[PDB]
Amino acid sequence: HRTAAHTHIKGLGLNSSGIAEKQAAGFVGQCAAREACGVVVDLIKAHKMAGRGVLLAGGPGTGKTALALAISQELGTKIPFCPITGSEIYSTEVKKTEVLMENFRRAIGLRVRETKDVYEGEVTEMTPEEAENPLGGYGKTISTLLIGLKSARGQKKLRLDPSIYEAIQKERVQVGDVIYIETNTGACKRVGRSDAYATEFDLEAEEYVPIPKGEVHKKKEIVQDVTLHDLDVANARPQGGQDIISMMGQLMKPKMTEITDKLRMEINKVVQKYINQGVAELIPGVLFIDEAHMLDIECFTYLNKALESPIAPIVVLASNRGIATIRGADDLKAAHGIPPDFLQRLLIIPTHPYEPDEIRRIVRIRAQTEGVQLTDAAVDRVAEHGVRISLRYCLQLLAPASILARVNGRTQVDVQDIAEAEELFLDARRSANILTSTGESGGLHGFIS
Amino acid sequence: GLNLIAAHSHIRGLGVDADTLEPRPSSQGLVGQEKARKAAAVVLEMIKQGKIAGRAVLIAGPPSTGKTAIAMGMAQSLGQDVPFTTLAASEIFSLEMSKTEALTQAFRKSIGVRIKEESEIMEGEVVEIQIDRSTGGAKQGKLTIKTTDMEAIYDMGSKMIDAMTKERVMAGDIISIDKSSGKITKLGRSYARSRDYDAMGVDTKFLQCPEGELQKRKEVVHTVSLHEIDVINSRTQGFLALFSGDTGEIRSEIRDQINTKVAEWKEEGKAEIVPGVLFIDEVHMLDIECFSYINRALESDLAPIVIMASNRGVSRIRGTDYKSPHGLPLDFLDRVVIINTHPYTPDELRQILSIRAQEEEVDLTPDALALLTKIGQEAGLRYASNLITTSQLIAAKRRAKQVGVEDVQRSFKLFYDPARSVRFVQESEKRLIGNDGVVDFSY
Amino acid sequence: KLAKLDELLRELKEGGHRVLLYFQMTRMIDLMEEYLTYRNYKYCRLDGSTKLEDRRDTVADFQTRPEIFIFLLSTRAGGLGINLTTADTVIFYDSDWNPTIDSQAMDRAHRLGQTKQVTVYRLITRGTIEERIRKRALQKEEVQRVVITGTGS
Amino acid sequence: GTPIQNNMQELWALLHFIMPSLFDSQLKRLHMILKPFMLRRVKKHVQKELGDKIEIDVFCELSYRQRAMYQSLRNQISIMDTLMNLVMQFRKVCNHPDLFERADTSSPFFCGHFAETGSFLREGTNVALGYSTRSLVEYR
Ligand SMILES: Nc1ncnc2c1ncn2[C@@H]1O[C@H](COP(=O)(O)OP(=O)(O)O)[C@@H](O)[C@H]1O
């Protein structure tokens, strides 16, 4: 429903031969770049290579971000697409190379089958049994809980460990509640009151729920999608146990930490065992670093290590800059704003500025996508602004002009509505002329320089 | 498996004769760089003998001349028996700790303490368990267990009954017991009892019964770095910081105590010290404060050997406004020896591209290999190696069995090399954002 | 479907209508029966698992008393037999490929003695295999008027 | 009330049943040979007070859970060359996604060791639940 800058892009619009159709899937042109992005898509779906780099190089507005979004749509929702700008790397909580590693590991997926081994029932009886600790100083402790669980099919009595009773205490369970006990974690969930007690006459909005069907004891098979980053984080700041560290970890403020390479190599071995057990399959995906010129020489130096990793994702960089100074390396200038050293690692896909007829065709696609009807004179007038000023500028006029048309009661945008939109809504260069013309005047009505 | 094909996957070692240290023209995945590979072979001898402390070696050379390749060769030829620490210099700029702390930690990771410990361990298939609960539980119980060679009953103490009931041990389970501590690990399930396992899905695997003695004195060899001993001693569960990474700046009196303690264990023979190596890739990204620290951190008897790589010419040292060879201060370079790597000849480019093509799954026609070699001479070894993957994917899409010249030519046309992309930005200059921020969006 | 059914059942119950729901899957009669118990609707059920005396009485119950809102009814076990003429609404939650059977089901309501105008709803889901079902059924009912017309004798 | 069914041989089985001396085993001819053996009055000509069956093919649309299932199942048709399975499996999610795979009490992936139950039958009515939950990252 809501329409954004790239809502018309649906894919790369390629033939089965890997050749670009001149207008397909929302694209016009960029055919050589769309074909190169098609080969990138097939590099990813092959899931055989680690740590290949791609640079989308080309001026602002030449569809580099459209192409990266089209890759994400060609890959589909199974494969991790991890998009960031270079400005996102500058965390205050952790070093910049940490968020590089997190995003590298968000780009690597895992699908894993999990057995939940579990107990369910209406709580029929519940009875604690106690330890008379002589000299600990904390007084007594509870040694076990005996609890009776009843389902529709059968019944059990469980002698719970103290740490599982603490889970039940946290869950505020009472007799006649229906509860769930995941033995994997030792976590307890209160599902509700038993429907045997269903009555209006309690002030609190209780969940009255039926008795669980089947056996009290069950094993559930669940297929889970996780990334390596989800595993890293789960084991860095643990919260799954009923131990005291896990317990207090749920109360303290969330905090990112500079996760060590020891934890990452340990989790590689954990995942390798899930793969060898056949319960998991690896789904390596891609990290898209938009605005990659906003990185710095320390980031690029770190990618030289990170891309050597034997399970690194595929990395797609976009840059829009000519010969430019490398950030943090103020004496060094290079093409794309990328160090010469790191540029040797990339495959560069150049993107090119549009012809007037391509711009005219994009205007029609975009008008159809925003749902607005134009006359051909209107489409030509907007296309002229796309040629004379900028594609982005002319596409920004469609929504204002549609309102201005509707305000006069006409449902179709014609040249008068664009002629008004041009005058209400200036571009960067007409505005820069107003600045420059006025800036001869000082005093009250000058622009501040 | 998990491990995919990466840039260095073909490197299996240094490719050097163990008797003479003469490098072979190609072996173990390394082609050429013979003078540099011989020097790296002498450094491996220094590392493996452990005698010398705190040598620093710089691998200096142009980009893509095998500086990382040789570093991977050394790591692979030391194997798992020695601490090898791979630091990117960019990592020292932590927010969690100072640069010199991060350099101390990196040095401390690179010295191992090697410790040998026995345990009696009991391993076998469970024939039976009975437990008496009276009703508070665990009053008494008996375990029957077997191998293919032996069967025994054990009377169990109540804390072993708690271990057994915790790990839900049942008949047919194949278990190991570390009887020095009584943790029990369920190695698997016997096939002979498969039908007892009514709650196990069809995906369940089954083992054969264990072999020999039910009880064995297994000997374990541990290597723990000095950094691990430091971090263990930092707080009540300090070892967790080896994973979450939130070590603070660990106080130096802790380290001094540990240095004394380990020298004590060495002289008592309780432990051995295993000096490893620290690799610092892109050492030129360190600053003048890092170098003045490293100067004196190398002087310890608990210093590893350090190995460093630089692409840089006469270049500005970070944290100062003057320039020095390799980007490194002469103050530091006095304590360093340099190994220099050269550019490749065309037959070396041909061989490296061949090895890269055989490490990848790529059937490559001779004319495609010749074309990729010429591209290598003109566009560089990395670009030609990136075209191998690309041409395979193009060949596959047209259903071809081999990568032909046709596929390399599509790859060359679709993806620019750095020199063509530099030309592209120079010809496209007004449409790209220049260093003055100016750009023209118009046609 | 169940969303659009829930809206439709509310509009019908606020309308005072009484409804027969046909299913091609008896497990959907179980799931639907949960939803009904989780709301205020008094209901009855027939399908191919019920014993014949239960069929006799549940039909008699439904025809007896207007407090019962909804009658869940499997397509084949429930489409063929006796009058249900104090319904007024028929919903095919799922539609049989053989259009005759849906016709029999509809005409358990649309029958001699029928109290009010029968309205039939069919909960077609756009873009699913359900479209093929209703196409095949509509083709077949056309063929079944090519291959007969006229009184006979 | 619906003799014609799927095809004409499936009509012959009903005609053979009544008159197997006559019938054993061009469409316009049929109406003139069935006429002695069939009678079919129809509710437009008869019982005119029973006003016509008002009908609404609703053409409602999938929910998000259904289309997530549907697309993963429709992907199998692209892999094909099994519709004898899939038409019902599609029809199942058309009716309700819990028929295909029922939604249930759920939790995050647990990245840890625990001792799972090997037999439900041998567990009995009284059982001790120890705390088995343990990390797979296992520092020695
Ligand atoms: N070939 C194309 N076909 C259709 N729309 C395009 C094309 N290229 C760019 N656009 C649209 O024009 C706008 C500018 O492109 P964008 O990708 O943002 O440029 P940049 O390279 O600066 O990211 C976006 O709204 C994008 O959807």
Ligand SMILES: Nc1ncnc2c1ncn2[C@@H]1O[C@H](COP(=O)(O)OP(=O)(O)O)[C@@H](O)[C@H]1O
């Ligand atoms: N002598 C060699 N033998 C085999 N492979 C090599 C050799 N030199 C470089 N390579 C490979 O070519 C690529 C580029 O060299 P690399 O060592 O990564 O560059 P740098 O020297 O800039 O670190 C790597 O994939 C590396 O494995």
